Amino acid sequence: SHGGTTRGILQIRSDQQQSQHALENFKREWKSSLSGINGSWQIPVVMADDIKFVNMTPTANDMQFEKWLN
Amino acid sequence: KGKIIKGGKRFVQVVDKRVVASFTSRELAMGIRNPRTELSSSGYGLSEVEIAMKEFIAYNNTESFNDRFF
Amino acid sequence: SLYGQQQAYAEPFIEMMDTNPEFRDKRSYMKNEHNLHDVLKKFGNNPILNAIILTRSNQVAMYCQPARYSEKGLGFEVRLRDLDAEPGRKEKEEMKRIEDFIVNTGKDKDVDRDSFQTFCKKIVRDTYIYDQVNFEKVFNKNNKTKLEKFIAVDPSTIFYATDKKGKIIKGGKRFVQVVDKRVVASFTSRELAMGIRNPRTELSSSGYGLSEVEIAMKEFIAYNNTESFNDRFFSHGGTTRGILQIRSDQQQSQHALENFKREWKSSLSGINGSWQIPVVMADDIKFVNMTPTANDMQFEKWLNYLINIISALYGIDPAEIGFPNRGGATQQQSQNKGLQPLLRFIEDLVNRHIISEYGDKYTFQFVGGDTKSATDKLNILKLETQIFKTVNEAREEQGKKPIEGGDIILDASFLQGTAQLQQDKQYNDGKQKERLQMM
Secondary structure, three states: OOOOOOOEEEEEOOOOOOOHHHHHHHHHHHHHHHOOOOOOOOOOOOOOOOEEEEEOOOOOOOOOOHHHHO | OOOOOOOOEEEEEEEOOEEEEEEEOOOOOOOOOOOOOOOOOOOOOOOHHHHOHHHHHHHHHHHHHHHOOO | OOOOOOOOOOOOOOOOOOOOOOEEOOOOOOOOOOOOHHHHHHHOOOHHHHHHHHHHHHHHHHHOOEOOOOOOOOEEEEEEOOOOOOOOHHHHHHHHHHHHHHHHOEOOOOOOOOOHHHHHHHHHHHHHHOOEEEEEEEEOOOOOOOEEEEEEEOHHHEEEEEOOOOOEOOOOEEEEEEEOOEEEEEEEOOOEOOEEOOOOOOOOOOOOOOOHHHHOHHHHHHHHHHHHHHHHHHHOOOOOOEEEEEOOOOOOOHHHHHHHHHHHHHHHOOOOOOOOOOOOOOOOEEEEEOOOOOOOOOOHHHHHHHHHHHHHHHOOOHHHHOOOOOOOOOOHHHHHHHOHHHHHHHHHHHHHHHHHHOOOOEEEEEEOOOHHHHHHHHHHHHHHHHHOOOHHHHHHHOOOOOOOOOOOOOOHHHHHHHHHHHHHHHHHHHHHHHHHHOO
């Protein structure tokens, strides 16, 4: 019912922060190629200097404080 | 007046949105296994497929996701 | 026309334009393809499906012998319609003749013709692949009223005939055979049967049955390409273990590499020199792995799931075809749901199509292999008789005549009560002699 459900952040290093128009076109390409069941198994390609993915939540979530409730 | 009829012909057959024939109560039976009292349904039964529609599409697209690897 | 004279419509009001006027085509569920049995014939060769077919055929083949010729009760039998009705020498002979006729599939023996065992083995395949079964009858030419022979015909070539208006016909010839899209012959309803195991009411199918192969088509192709994926590791490349890199300022000439290979093969190849260790004095050496330490089959649980659902569609236990049940056990109940409905379907078809030619008073049924149910029935009777039922009432109830001895209820106590009552009754009734003596 509230936020905090993010899996992680995809960082892309660049000398300049890309203009928002470029990021919107990036999103358009990403959605057209990968979004949904359509193109689910495909792999994108990017030629940036360095890319990282930092995890904000664990691999698999589950209920917390179960024994406390019991 | 739009109200459902009791006397005489009560059930009607429709094909391609055209009325073809109609039947007396004795001439045609009507069995409802999962009845409901709310006015919205007007006596028509509730099918489990409608209840499980979301689950059915989820199963279908899960199977598609598994098969799309091959 | 499809079933008879009726007020409602049970056939498509508007005909399919691309179909030939002479008959109504059989089409897929979604109308995706107007030609279905052609693609089902492709899946007819699948091993899993063929394994199920062969297992069920072997199961049925045991039952396909007459009872009275078998030392044990397993087999089939013909009897009067009423179990309580008495038999007779004439009727017994007629039933024996009919049983022999069914066994030989004709009036007289002929080695060139199918025994009923092979007929059933054909029928199960046609029932489980196409969900449609047909067999031709051969009435006597000297007398149309009576029957001589009957044999099976492939269901793929048979269609429902239609009139000039395109509606399915009832009177006269109703079924038509088509080969290479050409009409060859047509048959009267009595002359050709039509068995549908999985019927449907929607106008789109127009009475044609729904085959499980069409439902499992996606699963079947998934199984096929999964097997191909597993086999392509061997039948195609990608079996390398790794690459042995040797760093050098210059790439060695191919002659040097060939001599290197010669030395390597002479020293290490084969069992000979298997345990030896070579020595190399290069700057740096690496071995990079392209495949894991040990290989094995992939997508195993996917295959188990697919075959489990395919088996569940046909009602067969996956354990019979060498797969694990994803739930339950990981046989009587599996048999009860799997085989018995098929036997009853064949029973009803054969009865209503063959025995109709001889008379209503007879019927055809299978027997045997159901001791436990009969045991429970006898146990019901054995418990009931202790308190409730007399011996003679039960004997009458099961189409038999009473035995002299009284309609006794079997309990050692109850007999003593009747005997004691009779003994004391005779004592009391004996006092009438004294009553008359005073007269």
